[PDB]
Ligand binder design. Structure first.
Ligand SMILES: O=C(O)c1c(CN2C(=O)Cc3ccccc32)ccc2c1OCO2
Ligand SMILES: O=C(O)c1c(CN2C(=O)Cc3ccccc32)ccc2c1OCO2
Ligand SMILES: O=C(O)c1c(CN2C(=O)Cc3ccccc32)ccc2c1OCO2
Ligand SMILES: O=C(O)c1c(CN2C(=O)Cc3ccccc32)ccc2c1OCO2
Lengths: 149, 149
């Protein structure tokens, strides 16, 4: 569980928001890109894996699952690339709910920045610090630390 | 403190590499930018603070210390902005040594990517996973987890 991440792609203002969620904690990382390509997805995973111990990634769709560039980045970074098929049917709605919540937070900060990418990073901050009573940021560190010890 | 980070700026291939180092662990995050502006530095800190519990940032120079954009981002993110003056004289050489090591790693991966930004992220990965026997990635998580508990 502590090394499992899920990729997610959502759209806003004619742009793409690429999201990685740490499944056990709800912690997220996100970036804005013009469009979802293998190359952008590969780069995003390289960034992620340098920052957290990414063991397994459930890809967000078949194109990223198939992409040789993505497969190469996963090989390079020591990541097991898997499908994101909701074998547990709960996963479709959970991703839906996350995107809705993320977009809500983005709406709450949107006027504090000119560029969407900035609003997205503010939303990542707010999401990861929100107390649920631990935050997602606290949960991910605790989960991984316990795994190391 | 577990919340203390140091900003660092170095140059390669006519571009700027902006680095944040977690002082207690040696863990790093980095990005390539065309040039170091207040705006780029502010954005980098917003990204960092959404991902790790950043309490204090020692800025890399007086322009970023002075920048109203940087000060605004620090206020927004709940970061105490401080100078980076080596009151301990050892800090100048330690940063120097880090940049030299980072550039060495970049050289070792440079031919595996077209774009410098990609090589920099590969170097971040290698640095953060390198054992010596825990890695920087392991140390940062352990330090912060202990702080939470
Ligand atoms: O509000 C949300 O649903 C939400 C989540 C939910 N999340 C978890 O806690 C565990 C998990 C696994 C897979 C997908 C999502 C989740 C996570 C991040 C969010 C959420 O709203 C905004 O950012
Ligand atoms: O060439 C780039 O800079 C680049 C790459 C390169 N690349 C692959 O095609 C497969 C791979 C595995 C590990 C590391 C790098 C690569 C991939 C994605 C990129 C690249 O520039 C921006 O986004
Ligand atoms: O406007 C942007 O998108 C942007 C900003 C905006 N900004 C400030 O000027 C001060 C501040 C504090 C907290 C959040 C945002 C801002 C800053 C940096 C940027 C921005 O676009 C890219 O880099
Ligand atoms: O080789 C390096 O010096 C290096 C460091 C050093 N580092 C720590 O271990 C603790 C610390 C506090 C303040 C500044 C630097 C450090 C860190 C990161 C690196 C280093 O080489 C490449 O990436």
């Amino acid at each position: 569980s502590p090394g499992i991440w899920q990729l997610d792609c959502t759209h806003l203002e004619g742009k793409v928001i690429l999201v990685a969620v740490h499944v056990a904690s709800g912690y997220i990382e996100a970036e804005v890109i013009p469009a979802e390509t293998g190359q952008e997805t590969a780069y995003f995973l390289l960034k992620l894996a340098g920052r957290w111990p990414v063991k397994t990634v459930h890809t967000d769709n078949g194109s990223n699952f198939t992409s040789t560039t993505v497969k190469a980045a996963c090989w390079w970074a020591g990541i097991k690339q898997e499908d994101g098929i909701p074998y547990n049917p709960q996963s479709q709605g959970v991703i839906e709910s996350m995107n809705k919540e993320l977009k809500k937070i983005i709406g709450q900060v949107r006027d504090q920045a000119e560029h969407l990418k900035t609003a997205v990073q503010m939303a990542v901050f707010i999401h990861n610090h929100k107390r649920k009573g631990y935050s997602a940021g606290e949960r991910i560190v605790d989960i991984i630390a316990t795994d190391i010890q």
